[PDB]
Structures are given as structure tokens and as C-alpha cells.
Amino acid sequence: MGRINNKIDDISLIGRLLICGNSVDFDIKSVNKDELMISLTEFSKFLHNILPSISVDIMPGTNDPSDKSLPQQPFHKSLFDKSLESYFNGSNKEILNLVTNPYEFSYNGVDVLAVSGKNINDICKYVIPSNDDDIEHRLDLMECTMKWQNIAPTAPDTLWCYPYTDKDPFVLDKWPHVYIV
Amino acid sequence: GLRYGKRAFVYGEPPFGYQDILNKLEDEGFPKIDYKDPFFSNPVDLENKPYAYAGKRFEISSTHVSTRIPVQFGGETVSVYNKPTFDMFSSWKYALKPPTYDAVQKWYNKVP
Amino acid sequence: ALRSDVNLTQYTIESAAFNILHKRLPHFSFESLTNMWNAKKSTTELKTVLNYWLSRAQINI
Amino acid sequence: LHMDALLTKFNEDRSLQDENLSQPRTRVRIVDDNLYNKSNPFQLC
Amino acid sequence: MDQKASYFINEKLFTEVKPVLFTDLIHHLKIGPSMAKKLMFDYYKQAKYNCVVICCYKDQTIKIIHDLSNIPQQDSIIDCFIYAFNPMDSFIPYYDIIDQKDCLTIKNSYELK
Amino acid sequence: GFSYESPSQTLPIFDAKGIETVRRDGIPAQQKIIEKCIRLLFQTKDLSKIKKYLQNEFFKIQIGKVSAQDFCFAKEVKLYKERIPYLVVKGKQRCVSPEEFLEGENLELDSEYYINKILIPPLDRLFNLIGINVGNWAQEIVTTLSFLIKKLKRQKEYQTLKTVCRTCSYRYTSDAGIENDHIASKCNSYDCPVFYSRVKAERYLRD
Amino acid sequence: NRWVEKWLRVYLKCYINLILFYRNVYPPQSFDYTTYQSFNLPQFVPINRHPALIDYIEELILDVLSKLTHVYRFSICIINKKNDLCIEKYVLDFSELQHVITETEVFDEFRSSLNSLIMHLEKLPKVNDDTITFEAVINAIELELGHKLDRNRRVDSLEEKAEIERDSNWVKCQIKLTSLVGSDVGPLIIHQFSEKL
Amino acid sequence: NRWVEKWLRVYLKCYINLILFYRNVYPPQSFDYTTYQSFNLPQFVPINRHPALIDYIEELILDVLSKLTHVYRFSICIINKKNDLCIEKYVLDFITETEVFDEFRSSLNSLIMHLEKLPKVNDDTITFEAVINKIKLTSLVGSDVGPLIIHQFSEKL
């Protein structure tokens, strides 16, 4: 909000914020509606304080209240405070945009792809007895994923049934400028 | 050791001891050890079930306070008959004992 | 011999292997095994049925 | 130095300028053209 | 004003016990952030509370001072102002809806329709 | 009863001879239920806990939260090397196959002759010598966020079942990539409880 | 009685929890800062995670709320075990209880009262373990317990059993006072007190 | 003087039974801990099963209460075997049927709470003896409404 740094000349350059995933964390085994509602209302406050100053981009994750597979739909129109109904009117979309887990944002002509990170986390969930959890290893895995033109290398652990018909979406068709994981 | 006092007397000694007590209880026509018979922990689950079975009357009772009988002095059960008299500005205390510090410490150290 | 020695219900190869050797072996229908054996491609199915029969033979010992 | 020294050096030297609160600075406009164009690729039924 | 601000601060500190932040002072007095920090420092001057100060270093780094005895990189400090005054030891603030109709220093390019 | 072969022996041994479990045709659930009730009666002598356990089991059977592996009659078809245990599943309200439950568009688990004539006879024989009846205990037995939570729990259960079945079939395929779940999707072993849970989750997700 | 029951319940729960935590009557490792204990709590208070203490306090608060119709004072005592002497006394007044809205305001008032209590407890010296225990005392207007068993109380459901076990669990009985802030809201007119030495 | 007689009888009987059971003067399993209730209290109160000891206790209680005017203190000393030393010495003695009832109830509750926090003692080592008239003293509640106020104290070592 520019209240801490006080350098408005530099803080005003942040056009929008991008929440990539994991905003609410619980164990789906033992949870009730009250805890999720409390966490969503706690998030709603923060949201109501940040919205009228800087735009926001909401993305789901692996521990978010959405589908566990990779192509997660947006959360819902519900699950937020009733005071946010002015933003969910369908007209003010540039201020708050709830998008799927993978997305290719064209920010002023710059194509950037963002993913919740379930693909890399599932690839690292195996133990391959070759190829000789550091930063360089994740970078090399991301580079290999970008070169192979396949966002999801492990089909059954990541992908779900009926993803598409005759044209998979996870196979890369156009290379982006920045790959955000 | 602990003195009795300035003026005091002494009563007769008990007839039984620590060893002969069970032996005398057995010879009197009673079992040496009365093991726990089947009982209902909940008084609602009684429902007068021990009526009979194949012509055999069974005695099944509960442990709750509502079913327990008052102690008798000389074979006569003593109880209050007159209605209570409520007094204003009274005080009360909770009777059940809370758990022990050592108990919860051992429960936490076991990492359940 | 297993029925005379042990006392169980199913009296199958998988039940015996699980109750004696503590190993659970999957079971496939005869149609699936035939479709796997007649596949020109997908050598994984051939290796699968081969290991299936080899394990069924070794459990007998 | 102590926290009091830093406080007396920073808060006392405050400029208290540019905080008009009536003509605020507008944030840089950044638009994601993929909002309404076409072909939401990962949007399934 | 330095008079109504101190009154509001001591009221919200002792009468209705709750931690006070400079954001509440800015929302109540309709003033700027630097003026709020100056008023907070003046109230810290001239004691039954605990002060919570924050220091902004270089490289856009923000931290919360806890020991108040060992301040690392004292030369790289660009700003250091008292953030809040809590009477209790556990900070644990609370957040609610705030109507910033005229108490905003940075406004978005788009307006709600 | 409980057996102590030596005074130094601390834990008892559940020794039974000619117990109600001895039967050519019988369900495994009855044996486990009888063993649990006997253990509860011998350890604490509490009839209320046994009544609560029996009512909970009856309510679970009436709802349909059973694994269906311990609720199957195993008929012996010939070809004497009779090794064809055809499974009857609770009837038709007959003699439905497990494939009917596999295509579980509807449920026919009835709190009926099965439950009654397989549970009340042995418990009644065991508790009449005590002086209590078990039939009366059974006679008394006769939004968006929650939906999303239930859907997520079901999906996580299905994913865990698929993962464990795939790693189980890894013994044969020796592979972890694609077509591994395809090979594991045909495991119809009726002697594995994971198969029943997997097909139940699939039927629940298909409806 | 429609909504003040739950509010008073959670207030008494947080009261007992903070009293047990800040006085070192139980190990702090068994406590965790949470916000949901089957009821939305107005603040991140340290609540214990032990089963026996859980339903113990639950039944205590249930009996207190049932007797509230005649109780005007609720006290939590802290006594030593080497000598049955009252060391600390925390009083909660219920003057007429404003008996027969804006739940956020009730939660704010409860939060302010709990903050005042925590500030008062933070000034007390450290309390040691090993049998520094607590008790419970109440003060009613006109009531008599321990005499409902004169007819054998033939039970028929759970309500009668609960009433009997609540009326039979009470036994009759016989410095620097520091006042705190209470709840000045309309329906919940509650006052707070404290005692030492 | 009507209700107080029988109520003091039953209170003394319960107190003697508790002081015999909670210590090792008599072995366990010889009492009925799951049948009787003393004063509608939720705690368990043990009563011995041997008729001889019950009649002995009743006879001595009647003999005490018959001459309650001249006696002012009734203690129950605990004698240690092979040493003849008084290890423990519990003492007692110097309206509406309800006030004496709650007085006896409170005294019994205090006695139970004080006995339940006692260290374990070895078996076949202590003998009891009733008497008619380095110290750790403990004071319990007593009857205050009746003009025959009964104090309650305990000693040790």
C-alpha cells in the first residue's frame, strides 16, 4: 500500500499482485465448514484492504479447496465475504481475476505461464535410480519440462480423467517469455 | 510417637487381622473374592433387562448414583423424608477431581 | 495339501500366498491375459503376463 | 547504537511531504489481454 | 494536533484495551503516514506499554526488531519508526473492514462502477 | 474364554473351541463382531459399551458403509477341486453378483434376514446365559462447502486407491509410467479388500 | 437464552482456559493457540488438547449455564495441595444477567475483557508446578442441591440423568481486590473481579 | 436431637469404614465399593461385608453415642505393628434435618478428598484402636449450625 516504504515513486510500479496458490492449508481428512469459513473470512479482510489499491490475480493450488488434479477450475463465486459482491458483479474483472491453476498471462504483450507447482512436486515425489532436492535440480527439471514441451510428464499422478479430446492442453504449442512455478 | 492426650481410654481389640480376615470370610459362607458381575455403566440402558432367562432370575444392576442404595445402619436404610429448605445466599463447591499434572505430562511425553 | 495342513476359506493361490507368505498377488481375468498375450506392441503386457506366470510357479515351491 | 538513537535519527528527520492525500498517485495500468479474447485453454466442464 | 491524538491513543490503550497502530491514527485524524509516525514518536516522548518498532533496510528489506539491542546492518537502515504500542506481551492484532473514502495515499487507476 | 498357560503370562489368549464361528457357510464380519463383544465383556464387564458397539455396527450395516467383503456368501461351484467361490451380496431387495454392486446404480443392502439370522442367534445364545436380550437393542434402531469437502475426500480416497493398486501391480509390469494404471485397472481379485473399496469409489464417482 | 447461551459458553471456556494456562496449573506444551474448538472463538486463545479436561470443562460450563437462572456469581479458585488454603480467587459477576444482536460487538467486548485479564495475569509472579491446583465455587440466589435423590429418580431419558448428575455433583461450603472491565453490552451485562493473597 | 442422633451414627459409621478401607489396616476385596452411597455423594463409599465387624462397629458407635454428654473427643488411633507407635491419629467430636445433613455431607466429602491424597502404606503392618477422651496437622470442615459444633483435624508422624 506504500505506507511502509513511503517511496511512492517506486511502489506505484507494482500494477497487480499474483497469488499463485496455497492460500488456505488444511487436512481434508478432518475439517469442518467452520474452519474453512473462518480462514476464508480472514483472507477476505486482507482482500478488502488490498483490492482498492492494487489489482490481484488469484490462482488455486494443491492444498486449496478445489480439485486435486492439475487443471483446477477457479474456486467459486461463493466462499468469500458478502462485502465482496461489488467485485463479483462480472464488470470489475481487471481489479480481481480468479483464473485456473495453469494460465498464460499476456501482461502488456508479455506472455508468462504460471503453474501451482504440482507437476514439479509430483516429479520430485519419485526416486529415480539414475541421473547421478537442491535449487539447481529444480531448475534443471523445469528446463527439461520446458524443452520437452510437456507440462505434465507424469500422467496418472498429476492428470485426471478426460482432460481433452484429440488435443491435449498440457502439450506446449507456443513458448512463453517467463515460466513461473 | 503421636501422643494420645492427657485423658483417654482404650476400646477392645478387633477380632480379625490382615491374614485371617479372608479365611474367616470364606468359612462364614461367602466367596473369598467377589469378582465384578456384569453391570450397566449407563442407568438408561438398564430397561429392567435382568427379569429372567430360561426360568433363571438374574441380578444385574448399575454403578450410577441414581441406582445405588443408601448405606444402612443395623439393617435399616436411612434416608431424608422431609422436603428440603432452600436458604438464600448459599455457596457450593465442585466435587469431581480434575486430572493430575503428572498424568497429562506422561500423556504428552508418549507422543500420541 | 494346503487344505489338509491349513484351515482357511478361499483355498486359492492368492489367498494362500497372502496367508502363508504375506504376499498379495493381483488376479486378472482370462480375457485380459489373452488380450495381453496377443498384443503385437506394448511389450509391458508380455512382461506382465510372464512375471505373472513365473510368480505363480515360484509360489508353488 | 541503540534503538532510541535510530528512532531519534529517523523520526525526527521526517520530511512529512508529498502526502497530500487529495491528489494521489495513480498505479501503473497493466492489462492482461487474455481476459476476454478467446480460447480459455484450461477451462473444462 | 498532538492533543486529540494522545487522548485517543491513551483511551484505546487503557480504557478499551487493544493494540494501537499508526494506521488507526491515520484513519481517525485523516493525516499522512509520516505525520502519523511523527505523532507516534511524540507520544513515545514525554510508561505502561510496550513499543514495537520496525526498520526498513536497503534492498527493499523489512524486519521487526525483537531484542532491541543487536540491530544488524545499522548503516543500511533507511527508515525506522515505531509501528505499534501494545500493552500486553503477545502482539496478536485484529483486523476489520476499513472505509478509506479519503484516507488513501495511492489510488488505483480504475474506479468502481 | 481367556487362557493363561502360566502365572508369569500377563496377556490372555482368546481360546475358543466350537464357537459360533464354526460354520461351513458364514460371514467374516460375524466372527469379528462376536470376538469384539467377547473381549469387551471379559475386559470391562460393561454391557453399555457392548450395546453401543452393536448399535453402531447395526447402523453402519443399515447405511451401507461396509466393505462388502465380509458380507458375501461364498457358494462352491464345481470345476472335485471346487475352487469357484461365487459371492452373493445381500440379496436383491435374489442372489445378486458382485458385478451388480460394481455397477451400483442403486443399493439393496437390507437390514433383513441376513443381519438378523447371522447376528442375533449367536449373540442371543451367548447373552441368554447372562440374562439379557439382544433383539430389543436392534428393534430400537428401526451446504455447498460440505458438498465440496465430501467430493474432495472421495477424490483423495480414489487417488490413494489408484496409487496403491498401481504400486501393487508394479510387481508384474515393473514400470511406473503410463499404461501401468491401465494394467492395474483389470485386477478383479475378490480376495483383496482394496478392490471392493476401489470399485465402490468408482461407482460413487460415476453417480 | 436463544443466542446468549453459546456466547456465555465460549466466554466461560476462554476464561477457564486462560486461567489454567497463565497460572501454570497444566503444562503449556499441552496448550496450543487456536481459534476453533467446536465454536468460533473471538481471539487466538491457548486451549488445551486433552480429552478428559475437554469434557470436564464442558460439563462444568453446561452445569453453570443451566444453573445461571439462579446463580449471580461464579468464582474459580486456585489453591495449594500441601495445605487446603485459597491462594487466588477470580470472580465473575452476573448481576441480574440482563435476563429475559451484532455478534461482532459481543466478540469485541469479550476480546477486550480477555485482554484485560491477560494484562492482569502478566503482572503476577511465576507459578510453579507440582500440585498447585484449582477449584470451583459458585454463589446462587435461592437453590438447594443434593436432595433430588429422595425418590430414587427413576430415569427415562438422558435429560433426567443429566439433571440428576448435575444436582448431585455439588456440595455445600462456607488481600488485594483488583477490578477489571466486563461486558457493557445490552444482553450480556457481565462484570469482572479478582483477588490475591 | 432427633435427626442428629441417627445422622451422627451413619456419619461415624461411614467415616470408620473409609478410614479402615483407604488404609492397609484391612485388606481390600473385603468391602463393597460399588453398591452403597453415603450422603448422595458421587464418590464411592466402601462398606465391609463381614457381619461380625459391622456389628462390632455398630455396637461401639451406639456405646459412644449413648454417653456422648461426658465425652468430648473420639479419636481413632492407628497403631503400627512390632513398634506399638501411633503413626496416624484421626480425631473428631467437640435446627432442621437438612442443615445437619449438609454438614455431614461436607465433612464426609472433605474426609474423602483428604484420604484420596495419601501415600500408599504396606500391608499387614498397621492396626487400629478406638479411644475415648514433627507433627503435620490438617484441618477439615465441620458442623457449624448445630450447638454441638464438631471440629475435624488430622495429624501424622
Ligand code: SF4
Ligand atoms: S487391489 Fe488389485 S491391485 Fe490393488 S493391490 Fe489388491 S490386488 Fe494389487
